[PDB]
Amino acid sequence: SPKEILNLTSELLQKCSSPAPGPGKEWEEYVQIRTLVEKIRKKQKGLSVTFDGKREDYFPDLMKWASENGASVEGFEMVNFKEEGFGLRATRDIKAEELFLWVPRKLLMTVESAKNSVLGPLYSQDRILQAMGNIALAFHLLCERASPNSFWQPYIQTLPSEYDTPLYFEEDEVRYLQSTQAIHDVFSQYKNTARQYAYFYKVIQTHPHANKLPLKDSFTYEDYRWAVSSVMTRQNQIPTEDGSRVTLALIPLWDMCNHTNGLITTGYNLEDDRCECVALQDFRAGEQIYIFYGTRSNAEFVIHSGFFFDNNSHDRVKIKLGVSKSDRLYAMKAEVLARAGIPTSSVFALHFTEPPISAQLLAFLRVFCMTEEELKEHLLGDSAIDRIFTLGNSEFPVSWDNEVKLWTFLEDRASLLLKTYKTTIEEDKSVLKNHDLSVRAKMAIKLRLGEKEILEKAVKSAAVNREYYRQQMEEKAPLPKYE
Amino acid sequence: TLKYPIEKGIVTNWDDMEK
Ligand SMILES: Nc1ncnc2c1ncn2[C@@H]1O[C@H](CSCC[C@H](N)C(=O)O)[C@@H](O)[C@H]1O
């Protein structure tokens, strides 16, 4: 058996270290990796360390441990909500902007605490650990989990045992994402995690600095999937105690708040050396306490956080664009972009708003559609820098013609992207209405529906903008000038 | 505002072969 696992992890390492097989082979590669991971997983015992009690049996220990080390533990309780899982619920009225939660640095698990732990010796030898604090945090979490006397046991025993990151999806649940933008990130995440598991399985076997690790005696795929899912769904960037550098950290107690829309209200207080959270809104006694995780897209919430957020006001899709080297004005356009601080080719975002495009994407599209005479006015003379300064401002176009061309282009391109999906928006809504689906399956379908609804909105917005600027052109309206 | 705003679950790079 142990030699069999070594052989299997050896094959898995070579499979997941091979170069990308080509985008049209990525689904086939994905299933091939899945088959190998599941073969290993079925030969292992799940999580190496499990706990006797229910998850909620350990929340009092979490509170008592947080209390002894200076954290806030009054005014909220732990409740298992159907929609979000476990969260915090107010036990008293909490006013907006009230400082209601604080967590001193001693309670955090950080890259720095990883370096000073039993993982320290291996951390100083392995180049992946030194370069990637998120993987370092994951192994820190696993080593302390398997250490019964770890300082952080009261926190670890309250963590989830399973997540809804795509690593946990069934094959047919990921299959819903075929032909989307998001599925490539699902593929990468799965291949990344399998490669890392196999790589570190063998590193732990061969390095003497790993001899004192609990992972030397038991390190399963389920261990690693759990550890990386814990870190990707919960990790945070905080300053170092020095204040001059940033590090990654798990923040007990506060990380039990679930997400709602709003603004970030959690910050780090270096003077008191603690995490501090003020209330995002009034919370009456008996209401769930929410925070705003950040301006992430639903693709990021699904892949990295394991949930889909309905009415995510910050949703977006990618659109890759670049000036073609066969364009005869390539040199001029590249130089205008360079003076504006924009690459010649890049990945931009389309947002679910109006306009759908950022200042940087507007500026790129203006240059992308410029005539030679317009390019020359952005390259020469005493007004050239003034012209570049306004390139990302919707109120000061280059010319009416430039606007009509760029919104025509964006309308055409967004329409073309819609045609590359296997299903239509109307088909996706029918699936969600007429089938009975798992949470994970719904996350997948809503994600692919979301991508198309953003593109459809961009098509409508670009068509509306095209009509607007075509009217200004036909009416010979004076172009606005920044003065 | 907050000198050190904390984004819960900030996205990190996991591609060890890229970086
Ligand atoms: N608005 C929301 N809807 C659904 N699940 C949510 C959510 N906000 C947060 N979550 C869940 O909470 C996780 C972040 S940690 C928050 C505490 C967590 N529910 C727990 O039981 O430990 C996410 O990975 C997701 O599973």
Numbering used by the authors:
A (entry chain A): 20 to 502
B (entry chain Y): 66 to 84
Manuscript excerpt for this entry:
Here we elucidate the structural and molecular determinant(s) of target specificity of histidine vs. lysine in the active site of SETD3. On the substrate-binding surface, the residues are diverse, reflecting the fact that the three enzymes act on three very distinct substrates—the large subunit of Rubisco by LSMT, RelA subunit of nuclear factor NFκB by SETD6, and actin by SETD3—with limited sequence similarity immediately surrounding the methylation target. To facilitate the methyl transfer reaction, SETD3 provides a local environment that promotes deprotonation of the target nitrogen N3 of histidine (and concomitant protonation of N1). Most (if not all) SAM-dependent MTases use the classic SN2 reaction mechanism, which requires the target nitrogen be in a deprotonated state.
In order to further grasp the measurable activity of SETD3 on K73-containing peptides, we attempted to improve the enzyme affinity (Km value) by increasing the peptide length to actin residues 66–88 (as used by Guo et al.). Indeed, the lengthened peptide decreased the Km value (increased affinity) to 5.2 μM (pH 10.5) against K73(66–88) peptide, which is about four-fold better than that of the H73(66–80) peptide. The structure of SETD3 in complex with K73(66–88) peptide and SAH is highly similar to those of the SAM-mediated, SAH-mediated, or sinefungin-mediated H73 complexes, with pairwise comparison of ~0.2 Å across 866 pairs of Cα atoms (two complexes per crystallographic asymmetric unit in P21 space group). The conformation of K73-containing peptide superimposes well with that of H73-containing peptide, except for the newly added C-terminal peptide residues (particularly D81 and M82; single letter-code for peptide and three-letter code for SETD3), which provide additional inter-molecular interactions. Peptide residues D80 and D81 form charged interactions with Arg214 of SETD3 (which also forms an intra-molecular polar interaction with Asn211), while peptide residue M82 packs against the guanidine group of Arg214. Interestingly, the side chain of K73 adopts a bent conformation, such that its side chain aliphatic carbons trace along the edge of the superimposed imidazole ring, and the terminal ε-amino group occupies a position nearly identical to the N3 atom of unmethylated histidine. The positively charged ε-amino group is effectively stabilized by the partial negative dipole of main-chain carbonyl oxygen atom of Asp274, hydroxyl oxygen atom of Tyr312, and a water molecule (numbered w3), which is connected to the main-chain carbonyl oxygen atom of Trp273. In addition, the ε-amino group is 3.4 Å away from the sulfur atom of SAH, where a transferable methyl group would be attached. Comparing K73 to H73 in the active site, we observed two subtle, but important differences.
